[model samples]
Target: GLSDGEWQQVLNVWGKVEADIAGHGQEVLIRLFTGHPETLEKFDKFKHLKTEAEMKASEDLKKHGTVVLTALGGILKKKGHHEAELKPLAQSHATKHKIPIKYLEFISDAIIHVLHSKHPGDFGADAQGAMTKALELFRNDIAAKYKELGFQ
Candidate 1:
């Protein structure tokens, strides 16, 4: 869970972020995939895409990006609901989806980049630092649950 000061910092940053999921979410994914195109090889819905055009034009990408947004939002808030929600998701990602925990690092950085890029003037070092700490905690929490579950 975030401390009082950390939570406020996150809320301040997110206040500007949540409104345009259709844009910000997709843009985050696009940047993630663009940065490491090989990451998409793990993505079933995106495996079929070969060009940037198809990537940008994907409704599935848009939908899943929004889905990703919801999951991220859940993480930023209190963890009771997010913990329960992510347990099942972690199981699937580990057992069937074959998702490495490192992907969380990729996702977190991509989201951070989106934040800095979206509001260049507003996203200072402190704001970026808060999101990173919280997401790192979120990453550790998820990966820890997987280890406890013997999912690896």
Candidate 2:
């Protein structure tokens, strides 16, 4: 679980971002709703938009978060010494997906791909490569999980 402060920081950023997207016409709002379904429940403004609009809006916003999170992942790789702590968390997601712990990285990479492709932005090919590496990490993880499960 996130600390209250951390949660607040996320909320503050998300709120401002949400507001900004909303300001960019309903298309953005639709994108947000598509990307973050839970957001629709929290923000009443999403209650009436058509589904297609939401999908487009969510896609438009992806370009940014994809780039941002990809960059963030590098920071995490350097300063993130929480590998041991990750095992338990990874196992949790793995159990849910019936994948092995070794494959968690692949699942995570898949998530990154979804985030990046859905929200592409000003990132260049190198950034796309980073995202690809992230996805590859996920694929390797899935491979590990299947191996763990003794699947031939």
Candidate 3:
């Protein structure tokens, strides 16, 4: 439910960050794993890896980060039309991956952190608030679906 102006701001800011997919994408994952090491246990491939450096150098980690960034980028491209595109992702993560709600929230926080870090002064209060609201929408979507599955 972003205003047209808020959506435009997201597009402009996200466009700049996503321009260097490899760097920002990698940084997002690194931030997540480094800050919440337990989250890595969810990924079988990454669970065996130790330390952020090892995780950062990991090709598998890079691919996963790329997938995440690509999905976000694709949704951002659609402006306000995001719910349908995000539904499958939410379902898959909840059912297929069985990722806990806390982890989903953690991911949201990590993405927000990366966005803030990349933009610095450009990511003003309004822009940050818009981005946070959008992420919360996505996180809530996944949490609702997860609850429907009768999970605690």
Candidate 4:
């Protein structure tokens, strides 16, 4: 739940960065995998990618990155529709991917890191706080489904 001011900041930063969605998404995953190598092991398709180059060149990475960024872009654009839209995604991850809460948190952090690195010029404290709160809200929503699915 963002204040109107925070929401405005989020939309402002998102508008600036959305043009390079793939780059932003790709770097987020890249940083996540690099910073916490074990996280890659959870992805059966990407587990065998032993190097950053391999990971970067992966078709799975490219596709997922685009999907991730696109969904995020849509979520940010549709403020009032967050719960309805996010529920399906959260449930899919809960039931299909069986992603744990920690990974969800990691994804939140990773996206924030990518936002900052991708748009350092515009990502000041206000922008960062807005983005952080937005993702935190998403993560919390996802956690409810995770718990229902027995992911804890």
Candidate 5:
């Protein structure tokens, strides 16, 4: 449901931030876990982490965090119309990971926070709105795949 303008608006900032993948990605997960510690319990690898300091120091956390951004970057490479790329991810989150769909919204908020925190002046009102809209579209796609795979 992202208009062309919204896609470009997001791409504009994404281009700048994509290079800082590991740092921003880790921060996004850290922020998400900070705001909603319950979500942290869902991560098999990171579930045992006891403190924010430990979370930041975790190489596993950083690698896993970087993956989401890489996936998103792949989608944006196709102008947000990539298919089947995230299909397995959707299925795994729904089935293997048993992730609640509601968490997708939390991830989106975390991503927005990281981007804005990194480039406050670049992520203004219009960019923020566009990014939200695009993330909604991505979340909906995953939700659809979840239902399709009989996990919903």
Candidate 6:
């Protein structure tokens, strides 16, 4: 935990980075690493499923990556959102960055939904497809961000 002044400094830095990412029509990337070999083994467990239980064993396979990647209380911070509000933000960022508005809408929705699930009932209800795309965009964008951030 940070002291009051330290916390404010953290927010200030985050705000600047957030604005840059927002302007570029991109999402922040996050990567999780547990140096312990045991943790690495667990990470490997999710790789492939038995052919027999292929479909059934996939209860959370693909989706779980996103959920775990954006764990509820830790890394993900709630950012207020509404589709109407996102429309212009997404449009402007998309136009400025040359990403399609429709794609941006999708990514926005996904990110917002993750925020909502982690901090439920905060943001206004949004169209489901928007949330789905938001996750897709966030996942892709964050990978790049993580690389730049030099997370190993």
Prediction-by-prediction clash tally: 0, 10, 0, 0, 0, 10
How many clashes show up in model 4? 0
* Clashing residue pairs found in predicted model 3: none
Ranking of candidates on TM-score, top first: 5, 4, 1, 3, 2, 6
Q: What is the lDDT of residue 2 in candidate 6?
A: 28
What candidate 3 gets wrong by more than 4 Å, as runs, is none
> Model 5 lDDT vs. the true structure?
0.85
| TM-score head-to-head 1 vs 5, winner | 5
Task: Give lDDT: candidate 4, residue 67.
Answer: 87
**lDDT (tens digit, per residue) of candidate 6 on 30-143:** 111111222222334433543324523354443544343333212213322233433443444344434333443343454453444444553334333333333444444444
Model with the higher TM-score, candidate 2 or 4: 4
Stretches > 4 Å off in candidate 6: 1-43, 52-77, 80-129, 150-152
User: Any runs in candidate 2 off by more than 4 Å, and if so which?
Assistant: 1-86, 99-121, 150-152
Q: Looking at model 2, which ten-residue stretch has the lowest summed lDDT? A: 8-17
lDDT of 1 by residue, 4-46 (tens): 7877888788777688876788888888888878788889889
Q: Candidate 2's residue-wise lDDT over 79-128, tens digit each?
A: 22334534443454455435344333433443434434444663345444
lDDT of 4 by residue, 19-126 (tens): 877777788888888988877887898888899999788878977788888898788877635887888888887777767778878888998888777777768998
Global lDDT scores for all candidate models = 0.81, 0.43, 0.79, 0.81, 0.85, 0.35
**Which candidate has the highest lDDT of all?**
5
Candidate number with greatest TM-score: 5
Where model 1 places Cα greater than 4 Å from the true spot, the runs are 79-81, 150-152
Predicted structure 3, TM vs. truth: 0.89
- My TM-score estimates for the predictions, one after another, are 0.89, 0.34, 0.89, 0.90, 0.92, 0.25
Give the TM-score comparing model 4 with the true structure, all chains together: 0.90
Q: What are the candidates' C-alpha RMSDs?
A: 1.9, 11.5, 1.7, 1.6, 1.4, 15.7
Question: Residue 92 in model 3: shift from native, Å?
Answer: 1.6
User: What is the C-alpha RMSD, rounded to one decimal, of candidate 1?
Assistant: 1.9
The predicted structure with the larger TM-score, 3 or 4, is 4
